Chains A and B, each alone.
With several copies, the nearest count.
Chain A
Amino acid sequence: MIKLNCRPLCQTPTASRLVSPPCFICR
């Protein structure tokens, strides 16, 4: 059994939304 060493050729990026607290509302 031979273990293979792998690594890709592309570095596709990533993107994510950031959420901020909503406006004040009285409860």
Chain B
Amino acid sequence: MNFNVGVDFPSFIAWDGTTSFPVKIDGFNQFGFTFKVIEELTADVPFNIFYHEASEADPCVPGPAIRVPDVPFCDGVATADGLATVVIPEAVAVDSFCAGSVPCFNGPWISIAPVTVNADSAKVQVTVTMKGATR
């Protein structure tokens, strides 16, 4: 017997390979990403993490993109520009998935997009998972 797991742990598309879709994290108090590949890669592909906030004309539409700030850990290096990023290694196999999440919330919406759109950035798929609804 399986369950309707989507009731408790819904997931939403964040990057389908041609467009980036803002995702709402307001009602969920935890979340994370998930990465997968569909073809052999030619080089590393980095990503940028953004966050949005309520637009002026309507409280249910996101505003312009705001780049996320970095948060150094207990003790360790910090990014050269103070902004969070994710780098997908070239060695990643087609039959594997990668998981990682940011430590801080910031605005009630989140987004992600590649640093440069090209034939290599279309070979990745990013999905966001939630947990712990608060309403």
Confirm or deny: B77 has a beta carbon within 8 angstroms of a beta carbon on chain A: yes
Query: Given A10-B60, A10-B95, A11-B135, is A5 in contact with B100 using a C-beta cutoff of 8 Å?
Result: yes
What is the interface of chain A mostly: helix, strand, loop, or mixed?
Answer: loop
CB contacts under 8 Å to B, within A1-19, are 1-11
How far, in Å, is B25 (CB) from chain A's closest CB? 10
Query: Given A9-B24, A9-B96, A10-B60, is A4 in contact with B101 using a C-beta cutoff of 8 Å?
Result: no
A11 to B85, CA, bound (A): 31
Confirm or deny: B98 has a beta carbon within 8 angstroms of a beta carbon on chain A: yes
Contact of A8 among B6, B87, B96, B102 (CB under 8 A): B96
Contact of A7 among B26, B35, B96, B101 (CB under 8 A): B96
Confirm or deny: B99 has a beta carbon within 8 angstroms of a beta carbon on chain A: yes
Q: Number of contacting residues on B, CB 8 A?
A: 26
Q: What is the chain A residue whose CB lies nearest that of B4? A: A5
Contact with A along B63-92 (1 / 0, CB 8 A): 000000000000001010000111110001
A11 to B98, CA, bound (A): 17
Confirm or deny: B7 has a beta carbon within 8 angstroms of a beta carbon on chain A: yes
Query: Given A9-B97, A11-B135, is A4 in contact with B35 using a C-beta cutoff of 8 Å?
Result: yes
Contact of B95 with A4 in the complex, beta carbons under 8 Å: no
Which residues from chain A contact B35 at a C-beta distance below 8 Å? 4
Contact of A4 with B135 in the complex, beta carbons under 8 Å: no
Q: What is the chain B residue whose CB lies nearest that of A10? A: B95
